[PDB]
Design an enzyme around this catalytic site. Structure first.
Site, PDB file in Angstrom:
ATOM      1  N   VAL A 152       0.835  -1.157   0.000  1.00 21.60           N
ATOM      2  CA  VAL A 152       0.000   0.000   0.000  1.00 21.60           C
ATOM      3  C   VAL A 152       0.890   1.233   0.000  1.00 21.60           C
ATOM      4  CG1 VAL A 152      -1.759   1.297   1.325  1.00 21.60           C
ATOM      5  CG2 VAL A 152      -1.895  -1.211   1.119  1.00 21.60           C
ATOM      6  N   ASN A 172       0.729   5.636   0.073  1.00 21.89           N
ATOM      7  CA  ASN A 172      -0.084   6.852   0.138  1.00 21.89           C
ATOM      8  C   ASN A 172       0.348   7.891  -0.871  1.00 21.89           C
ATOM      9  OD1 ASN A 172      -2.067   8.544   1.229  1.00 21.89           O
ATOM     10  ND2 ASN A 172      -0.441   9.736   2.164  1.00 21.89           N
ATOM     11  N   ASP A 195      11.039  -1.552  -7.854  1.00 22.07           N
ATOM     12  CA  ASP A 195      12.247  -1.540  -7.037  1.00 22.07           C
ATOM     13  C   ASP A 195      13.494  -1.934  -7.823  1.00 22.07           C
ATOM     14  OD1 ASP A 195      11.089  -0.455  -4.767  1.00 22.07           O
ATOM     15  OD2 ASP A 195      10.286  -2.379  -4.095  1.00 22.07           O
ATOM     16  N   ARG A 223       8.811  12.337 -12.273  1.00 18.20           N
ATOM     17  CA  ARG A 223       8.156  11.331 -13.062  1.00 18.20           C
ATOM     18  C   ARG A 223       7.714  10.111 -12.282  1.00 18.20           C
ATOM     19  NH1 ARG A 223       5.897  12.651 -18.012  1.00 18.20           N
ATOM     20  NH2 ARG A 223       6.659  14.815 -18.133  1.00 18.20           N
ATOM     21  N   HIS A 232      10.484   9.904 -26.223  1.00 21.50           N
ATOM     22  CA  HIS A 232      10.442   9.256 -24.934  1.00 21.50           C
ATOM     23  C   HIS A 232       9.710   7.899 -24.988  1.00 21.50           C
ATOM     24  CE1 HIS A 232       6.636  11.704 -24.620  1.00 21.50           C
ATOM     25  NE2 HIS A 232       6.208  10.552 -24.138  1.00 21.50           N
ATOM     26  N   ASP A 289      -3.021   8.534 -18.577  1.00 26.94           N
ATOM     27  CA  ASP A 289      -1.865   9.386 -18.381  1.00 26.94           C
ATOM     28  C   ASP A 289      -2.273  10.832 -18.116  1.00 26.94           C
ATOM     29  OD1 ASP A 289       1.332   9.482 -18.667  1.00 26.94           O
ATOM     30  OD2 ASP A 289       0.531  11.205 -19.783  1.00 26.94           O
ATOM     31  N   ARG A 303      -6.677  20.924 -20.758  1.00 24.44           N
ATOM     32  CA  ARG A 303      -5.342  20.644 -21.276  1.00 24.44           C
ATOM     33  C   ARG A 303      -4.720  21.870 -21.944  1.00 24.44           C
ATOM     34  NH1 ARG A 303      -3.464  19.123 -26.033  1.00 24.44           N
ATOM     35  NH2 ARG A 303      -1.595  17.846 -26.264  1.00 24.44           N
ATOM     36  N   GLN A 358       3.843  25.729 -21.317  1.00 19.38           N
ATOM     37  CA  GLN A 358       4.477  26.608 -22.297  1.00 19.38           C
ATOM     38  C   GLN A 358       4.691  27.995 -21.736  1.00 19.38           C
ATOM     39  OE1 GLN A 358       5.596  25.141 -24.759  1.00 19.38           O
ATOM     40  NE2 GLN A 358       4.313  23.316 -24.707  1.00 19.38           N
TER      41      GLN A 358
HETATM   42  C1  LIG Z   1       2.553   4.974   9.003  1.00 21.02           C
HETATM   43  C2  LIG Z   1       1.793   5.748   7.954  1.00 21.02           C
HETATM   44  C3  LIG Z   1       2.127   5.646   6.605  1.00 21.02           C
HETATM   45  N1  LIG Z   1       1.493   6.349   5.669  1.00 21.02           N
HETATM   46  C4  LIG Z   1       1.853   6.170   4.267  1.00 21.02           C
HETATM   47  C5  LIG Z   1       3.323   6.256   3.897  1.00 21.02           C
HETATM   48  C6  LIG Z   1       3.478   5.172   2.850  1.00 21.02           C
HETATM   49  O1  LIG Z   1       3.314   5.701   1.532  1.00 21.02           O
HETATM   50  C7  LIG Z   1       2.370   4.172   3.113  1.00 21.02           C
HETATM   51  C8  LIG Z   1       2.876   2.908   3.801  1.00 21.02           C
HETATM   52  O2  LIG Z   1       3.213   3.221   5.151  1.00 21.02           O
HETATM   53  P1  LIG Z   1       3.269   1.998   6.204  1.00 21.02           P
HETATM   54  O3  LIG Z   1       1.867   1.532   6.405  1.00 21.02           O
HETATM   55  O4  LIG Z   1       4.045   2.429   7.414  1.00 21.02           O
HETATM   56  O5  LIG Z   1       3.991   0.845   5.356  1.00 21.02           O
HETATM   57  P2  LIG Z   1       5.137  -0.089   6.025  1.00 21.02           P
HETATM   58  O6  LIG Z   1       5.620  -0.952   4.930  1.00 21.02           O
HETATM   59  O7  LIG Z   1       6.116   0.802   6.734  1.00 21.02           O
HETATM   60  O8  LIG Z   1       4.414  -0.995   7.146  1.00 21.02           O
HETATM   61  P3  LIG Z   1       4.604  -2.593   7.233  1.00 21.02           P
HETATM   62  O9  LIG Z   1       5.474  -2.880   8.476  1.00 21.02           O
HETATM   63  O10 LIG Z   1       3.240  -3.159   7.454  1.00 21.02           O
HETATM   64  O11 LIG Z   1       5.093  -3.016   5.874  1.00 21.02           O
HETATM   65  O12 LIG Z   1       1.439   4.835   3.962  1.00 21.02           O
HETATM   66  C9  LIG Z   1       0.430   7.193   6.038  1.00 21.02           C
HETATM   67  O13 LIG Z   1      -0.163   7.829   5.147  1.00 21.02           O
HETATM   68  N2  LIG Z   1       0.059   7.317   7.339  1.00 21.02           N
HETATM   69  C10 LIG Z   1       0.690   6.642   8.335  1.00 21.02           C
HETATM   70  O14 LIG Z   1       0.404   6.706   9.557  1.00 21.02           O
END
Ligand SMILES: Cc1cn([C@H]2C[C@H](O)[C@@H](COP(=O)(O)OP(=O)(O)OP(=O)(O)O)O2)c(=O)[nH]c1=O
Ligand SMILES: Nc1nc2c(ncn2[C@@H]2O[C@H](COP(=O)(O)OP(=O)(O)OP(=O)(O)O)[C@@H](O)[C@H]2O)c(=O)[nH]1
Ligand SMILES: Cc1cn([C@H]2C[C@H](O)[C@@H](COP(=O)(O)OP(=O)(O)OP(=O)(O)O)O2)c(=O)[nH]c1=O
Ligand SMILES: Cc1cn([C@H]2C[C@H](O)[C@@H](COP(=O)(O)OP(=O)(O)OP(=O)(O)O)O2)c(=O)[nH]c1=O
Ligand SMILES: [Mg+2]
Ligand SMILES: [Mg+2]
Ligand SMILES: [Mg+2]
Lengths: 480, 480, 480, 479
Positions: free
Chosen positions: B4, B6, B24, B51, B120, B193, B248, B257
């Site tokens: 996941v 954010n 990765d 990017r 590209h 995109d 756009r 531009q």
């Molecule tokens: C801890 C935390 C992370 N985030 C965001 C940052 C990252 O893009 C994403 C993942 O953060 P985490 O949930 O901390 O992912 P992690 O891999 O560190 O935890 P785990 O030990 O389970 O693998 O969430 C928040 O938005 N709020 C929060 O409190």
């Protein structure tokens, strides 16, 4: 020259006085475009691409907002346009001293590379500012716009770093309130925070920001103990407690993110390995090292997040070890997080004790059969001091308020007068433990050492303790 | 398994393990060090984004769309294999970008290597191959049920179109034709995109405009059109589609531009050309390449990012003096000066081959005004910008298929006349910006006279400030 | 067919046809005419929102959560039937609210009908029954595969808890987690909060909310004490504490705003005065009073914020007293806020004691000369219980967590394992005092009574105490 | 002292005590009970907002603009007196709106009282007069340095225009002040700026105009012999975009097909209730929904409440009106048949509007129909969509200045800006609805509608081939 408008996503369209533009359009200031605000955080929050440059503009603008507001509300303060510009310049330039990856540099690298020296980004900001002024002929431009360089350059430096009896020379006691705007030594309530809360939340993708605009509207200057100070309206006290709660939230979730920290650690390690072999040319063509560029501002001007990529892209075999670490970052082969715990009760951990801590963990003797045996060098222990900016103290005890019925009369408001739902302590320590050996069996072993160590030291039971070390947790009676 | 992340634009998005493995790698992580808008950051300080984060967003939206279609229409037989391939194409369609994004493919390469035609998109495909092969991804693809031969073809086709009728694609058959409309839509440009960059760039630029893709996804459907299965929009969304392209165009005019953003890109390009002989980038087999030839070797191109800018800026080698000097002028904000903007009238269009001549033409104008200084072709820069709705002269909405609520399986066309008379009557135009390399007041005045005279001589449109910058010239032209 | 609605909080939401049928009834559409925050709109002009749109949001989030759980854990056997029932409960949990929301159940009914115990939750169940029966919904439920006997029971149980060992009849123990979504009796963590946090903040103009989307992604079902319950990932514990902090902030600043409350109080007073003379026609043509409409759902259907205007616009002389109070609201001639204090230590104020409190304040005897003497009837005393939803208890002690290394193993996490910066208590009381006499001299007197009465009862020193009652505050040594 | 209030759009704004006094009256507070977008709330559930909060926003932005101009150009001699008058006008320009806003002046009154010509603007001036006189404001105005005779005139003129330099409230040198609240010259004013931001926040559409940017680049220059507000040349694109946004908002939200039909049903109900509802005005005299505009004391009591008064009524005389509102609650609305536009030269006159349903019923589609429909079964809604100036381009009536000569006003033509801009600035949309909602009636109505479009050479409806496959082939133009 005329005044410039710039569009900032946080503040919208802001005006910049020509003098400020001249300061901004220099190598010393532009350098801040190449330093990430949150360093290794970007490697966890992909929104956090922002650099010190844009944050600095925001701080300078908010500094101006606050001082303007006070002047409009209270003409008797005698705030001059000269005053306003000086405050804005201090705001702009308070981040000038930051190095590669911001707090990583100040917080991790320099302390390890140069333990003898004591250095802070604040000191760097003052030195950089001096270099900026002198290198770009700013003093003549300052006098052109009515500033008095001797007094005003002193004033600006004092706003950033504090004093170099009324201890300030840049302005007298009647203008004391001016020193509370950019960098507030009394209680930490200043415009730097206000910008970074809004800016970091916008880029991180989180809520919980602080309403500074509201606060500015209810701010006033009153006499307190024979000093003119900025006072908040009484009703804002809850918001102030909330402000520091937000700060703590941001540090827990983002600025001290377990992985963000480990990445910063790895980078710092790579920098240490490269320190001998990288050369940065300073004044007079003289050569410096990552760790000594802080001695020469001309060299420090050239010291940014770029060095990360210099090392990554290097082919010299002497840089192989450093380069390898950065490569592991790209592959996401990071040191593994074992766990987190806290000291119980009165125990506090001293900075001098930090070097021993990996040894302690390796010395623990968990009563479990292990395939592999780990050594001190295999462990990383990261000790984080979390507080409300004033160590053990409550910053709100150092805020002055006023009430609607007597706007000129300053008062104090105690925590008991506000709420019983507020924190009873304002400082604590977090201890995170990582392992350099990433394999499954090593990781299992590291968990046994870690949890045992927590038990041995009567630290708090890790949240996942029963899962990661089911055989260890039962021994500690306290834990259950 | 799932990770996941954010993202400030999309919130918390899930990534399949395969996608994580792709991400990765050095080839992907490289995108952290390439600004989305290049020189734009030097005009919009919010536009720090790279990017990398945009790529995540495109990949996530690609997944959203394909998932939505699959839920709504099981009969399409969309497989998890299909979903992953579309997400990978979305992630990887930006892999081929070079330093400062569009600057590199749009300005630098065409001048450095005119014989070659490079985009590209082509780079993305080559980088993708290198990424797969360098990191042993094919085994991992098979582990998750992908068939590398077919699927790698499919992915490359999504990014770049056919690698070569009736059906020109080999990665998937005609029944899955709609899948090729998601990541990079060659038919009408309506793809994920754009959806990401609209939202992302607006968030960072500080402009509230964007397109509601989430709405659009809810009303999207697949229908048969001319014996092909295509994505169709609800009839009522036609207005929103016109608005999309309007947005756009707004973004391009105001940001992408921007007159100054472009000139900064131009200066950087000039510096790169001057440094091209002296910078070496190590590729496969230790072989050395130049900025302009790193596109030939993906291992070298992997190391080619915005970093080069700072390598040049911080260089001490005298051979790089000229290049370094240009970048220093950027830091001091001593940019080439904007003289003005005009447009061709009526029939005339300007061909790319004509581009070299244009500065000569401006210098050849003979304004009937007394001038202290006389300017030469080499003192002028002429930047020709083609503004359109993505399809040169054509209206992209003519190439969209719709459906109505009363017959969801029946595809239809909707003409511009059926929608509105307030819509544009043309869908392409050209902007011509002129800059002067001599920045002094007298030179600048002269440049304005040449410029406006030139516009008149060529029957271009009257510049908006024409009567102010060239009061003696504008009266001669009766049309104006 | 599915209907799509654009909600500013959630964007474009799909609604199942059954849900649409429920929504398109007088019983549901009534919620358009009831302000979410009642008198709050008279303090926050952004807070125009009504129960109707909030209800759509709650229903939608309920669906999001149950869908997420089903996708992640097929073994739960969640059926589309289950999903619809949860969405309906979410939609309908606000059906029972009366004019001005909490004012009606919180202030008016308790005073108008003290013998009765009534709650909006009970109202929601009764309204739901009336909605179903009045509009022939049961046949439509069966058409979409629901089983009315079981499912109507299930829906009512979700809203109000057991209608009375497993105490639920609507679903068995294996589906116990479903009862934690809409209205969570165990710890209060439910989708109702998630919507109102985001919605109220959007409208109020406060940047705070709780990231429910993040939370949903890390939610799981695990066995706890032989029951299937929703568990949160361990790392989310800090966010949960933050969630309840946000709730408290919102109540302090907005929901319990001193003026918002007093406006609600005045409205209540006007309703009491009008109660005898307003008639509302219910079942069989039959007439009820504002206070008895709760007995007949047909009458209660017609009971909304409209009554406020009915009174305001009335010309009948019997309604003069009521109408006069509402007029005073329009002129902003409100009862005046005197101050706020809290009980010290472990003293708590019982509901039965509330009526005596105005008498106690009038009895105080401040040692200051007063022009006017005030009586019990001139005072209003408002006692507000502030907590984390569980009286004295910490809700987080009633949350189950899981860890990354063992997703099926539920755990507990204590406050001490998280942080010492957390609250030490989770409940407190606020006491606001107002005066019905608004003149300057009366107001001054009221302040003296108030502060004296705080001192006499060893309550906390009011924040402005030294300003409003400088002669009184010195007497109390504790205060200073 | 100044009151601070939190507005979600503008944040924390300060209000001068005089403005507070104006606000805290029945005449102003009445705006809390009138939806900004009327029937739009019944399509966009976010659009709960009322005229009240919008009015605060307009007043605040009016203040922002005038303050900015004063700070930048002291030579304008802008006084605090001037600033307050502009804010009051901003606050009070919406006072005259009636139940459901544009529904009332746009649909109800024209049908209820065709002889009368009435606009919310005229209502705002009358309400303002009533507000001032009912609440003793004039003394309070003089207390803060205003001169009621001149300044009340000025305020009314800002709202409604003039009651040679035609203004009496201020002289020619202050002419730029009349461009802030309600700009008769080109429609660029602070009212729009607030509603763009506010409506988008509530509607849930991320569309908008950057007014803050615009204010920073606004200046006063002499044009003709008048002092006018001028925009920086570079803002021209943004201005075109502003009107594009306005058009987008009207298409998607303010003229939403269903939002309009709801407004139409409510209007119908009001007409049916008009005889039986009584509203008490000055002297205890009784008025009807349609005559309350004659007495401000009665009009003060006339809000969205009237909708619920009818809905909750039990009197049998109100049965027909009540039934229509009940159908709204059940979502049994008149059915949308389709939309078309006039071709080329053709425009539709207001006098022609009544005939239109008859024409649609008179169309003879060559298709077999189970049911036959009549004029009374059809509703025809003609919407004039433009850039605020009928056929004209408002940007041709904007004055600009350039960075090299800030005091020299200029004009900028469309051709100087872009060929991607619209070639026309006005058009008409024609929506047709049917009062018979059954499937067979609907089908029939579609055939009449499309046939009618063809007969009149209107544009082919977007779904024409689907709703009337047998009709569309006949017209060659269409295909
Ligand atoms: C801890 C935390 C992370 N985030 C965001 C940052 C990252 O893009 C994403 C993942 O953060 P985490 O949930 O901390 O992912 P992690 O891999 O560190 O935890 P785990 O030990 O389970 O693998 O969430 C928040 O938005 N709020 C929060 O409190
Ligand atoms: N049904 C319903 N829709 C609402 C409500 N509030 C807003 N809406 C929106 O109003 C839009 C148009 O109303 P509809 O009921 O579809 O009217 P219509 O489209 O002419 O009729 P249908 O053919 O039944 O869709 C819907 O798409 C909803 O998104 C509500 O209370 N009920
Ligand atoms: C043109 C334009 C700029 N901006 C942003 C980009 C910049 O950060 C800031 C100022 O840009 P400009 O307004 O373009 O300022 P400029 O200095 O380029 O133009 P001139 O000097 O000729 O007056 O505003 C917008 O937000 N919207 C716009 O439409
Ligand atoms: C308390 C509070 C109010 N508000 C909003 C609600 C109102 O619209 C506006 C003013 O609220 P208050 O600041 O409470 O103003 P007040 O008049 O109630 O206080 P006093 O009379 O004692 O000076 O600000 C916030 O936005 N945040 C807050 O924390
Ligand atoms: Mg992880
Ligand atoms: Mg519909
Ligand atoms: Mg107040």
């Amino acid at each position: 020259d005329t005044m410039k408008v710039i569009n900032d996503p946080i503040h919208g369209h802001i005006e910049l006085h020509p003098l400020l533009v001249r300061i901004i359009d220099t190598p010393q200031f532009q350098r801040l475009r190449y330093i990430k605000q949150l360093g290794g955080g970007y490697y966890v929050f992909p929104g956090a691409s922002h650099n010190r440059f844009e944050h600095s503009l925001g701080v300078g603008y908010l500094a101006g907002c606050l001082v303007h507001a006070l002047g409009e509300k209270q003409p008797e303060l005698q705030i001059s346009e000269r005053d306003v510009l000086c405050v804005q310049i201090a705001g702009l330039c308070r981040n000038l001293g930051h190095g590669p990856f911001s707090h990583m540099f100040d917080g991790r690298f320099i302390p390890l590379a140069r333990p003898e020296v004591k250095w802070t980004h604040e000191q760097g900001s003052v030195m950089m500012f001096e270099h900026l002024i002198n290198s770009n002929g700013i003093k003549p431009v300052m006098e052109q716009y009515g500033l008095i360089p001797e007094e005003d350059i002193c004033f600006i430096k004092e706003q950033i770093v504090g004093p170099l009896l009324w201890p300030y020379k840049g302005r007298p006691e009647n203008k004391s309130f001016l020193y509370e705007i950019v960098s507030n030594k009394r209680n930490g309530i200043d415009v730097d925070k206000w910008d970074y809360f809004a800016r970091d939340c916008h880029h991180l993708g989180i809520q919980n920001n602080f309403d500074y605009k509201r606060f500015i509207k209810f701010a006033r200057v009153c006499e307190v103990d024979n000093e003119l100070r900025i006072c908040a309206r009484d009703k804002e006290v809850g918001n102030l407690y909330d402000m520091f709660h937000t700060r703590n939230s941001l540090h827990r979730r983002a600025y001290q993110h377990k992985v963000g920290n480990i990445i910063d650690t790895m980078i710092t390690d790579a920098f240490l390995k490269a320190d001998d072999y990288i050369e940065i040319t300073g004044a007079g063509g003289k050569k410096y090292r990552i760790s000594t560029a802080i001695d020469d501002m001309e060299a420090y001007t050239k010291l940014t997040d770029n060095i990360f990529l210099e090392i990554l892209y290097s082919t010299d075999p002497k840089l192989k070890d450093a380069r390898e670490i950065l490569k592991q970052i790209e592959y996401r082969n990071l040191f593994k997080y074992v766990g987190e715990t806290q000291p119980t009760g009165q125990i506090k951990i001293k900075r001098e004790d930090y070097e021993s801590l990996p040894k302690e963990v390796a010395s623990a003797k968990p009563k479990v059969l292990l395939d592999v045996k780990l050594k001190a060098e295999d462990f990383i222990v990261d000790v984080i001091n979390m507080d409300y900016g004033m160590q053990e103290k409550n910053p709100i005890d150092h805020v002055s308020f006023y009430c609607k019925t007597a706007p000129n009369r300053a008062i104090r408001i105690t925590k008991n007068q506000v709420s019983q739902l507020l924190p009873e302590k304002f400082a604590e320590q977090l201890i995170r433990v990582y392992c350099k050996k990433v394999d499954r069996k090593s990781l299992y072993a590291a968990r046994q050492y870690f949890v045992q160590w927590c038990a041995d030291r009567n630290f708090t039971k890790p949240q996942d303790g029963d899962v990661i070390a089911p055989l260890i947790t039962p021994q500690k009676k306290e834990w259950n």
